[PDB]
């Protein structure tokens, strides 16, 4: 019910489902972006996952316990987006991040474009550790997209 | 509204992967509601 892995986040009412995002189950905690769930509870099979920690400024939320993903981009190496697009199987895409330069420091950023419901897909280092989640970013002049590598703090 | 999760795979680095995308160097600001914007 909380087995480790990457998951789709779906919504359904009376008709079919829609994939609104993706997230990571690790160490019994589900990790996704705030804009995917708006910080609301999730169903997993017969069970309920309750929000535990989150921050709208970071655009992150964890379920069942505190944020567990602590790996950091090394600022140097290529990474992989494990993209889980709506209606498509999970695929690994390797890229060298660029940089979001902010007044509070630099953040790695990936220039990869996927549908909105791919939000929350994990970005990985060469050891397979999740160094952040995809989907909070900017649209540049030509209409293409750059996502921050958004990572929480493991307290 | 039923918001629910479904497993979609294992989290593994793929050896010999497709490398793509550029590496843009952008000046951005982040507001208190989580929006990034270009400066």
């Amino acid at each position: 019910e909380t087995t480790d892995g990457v998951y789709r986040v779906m919504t359904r009412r009376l008709l079919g489902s829609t994939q609104v995002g993706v997230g990571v189950m690790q160490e019994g905690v589900f990790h996704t972006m705030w804009h995917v769930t708006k910080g609301a509870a999730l169903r997993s099979g017969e069970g309920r996952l309750d929000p535990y920690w989150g921050d709208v400024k970071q655009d992150l939320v964890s379920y069942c316990g505190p944020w567990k993903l602590d790996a950091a981009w090394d600022g140097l190496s290529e990474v992989q987006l494990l993209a889980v697009p709506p209606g498509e199987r999970a695929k690994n895409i390797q890229t060298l991040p660029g940089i979001f330069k902010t007044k509070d420091g630099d953040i790695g950023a990936v220039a990869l474009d996927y549908p909105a419901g791919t939000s929350g897909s994990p970005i990985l280092d060469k050891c397979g550790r999740v160094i952040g989640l995809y989907g909070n970013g900017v649209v540049i002049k030509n209409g293409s997209y750059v996502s921050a590598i958004t990572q929480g703090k493991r307290e | 509204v039923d918001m629910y999760i479904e497993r979609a795979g294992d989290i593994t680095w793929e050896k010999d992967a497709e490398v793509t995308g550029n590496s843009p160097r952008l000046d951005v600001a982040l507001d208190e509601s989580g929006d990034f914007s270009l400066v």
Binding site: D113, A116, G135, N136, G137, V138, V139 | -
Partner: peptide, 4 residues
Amino acid sequence: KXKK
């Protein structure tokens, strides 16, 4: 983005 098919910014979020």
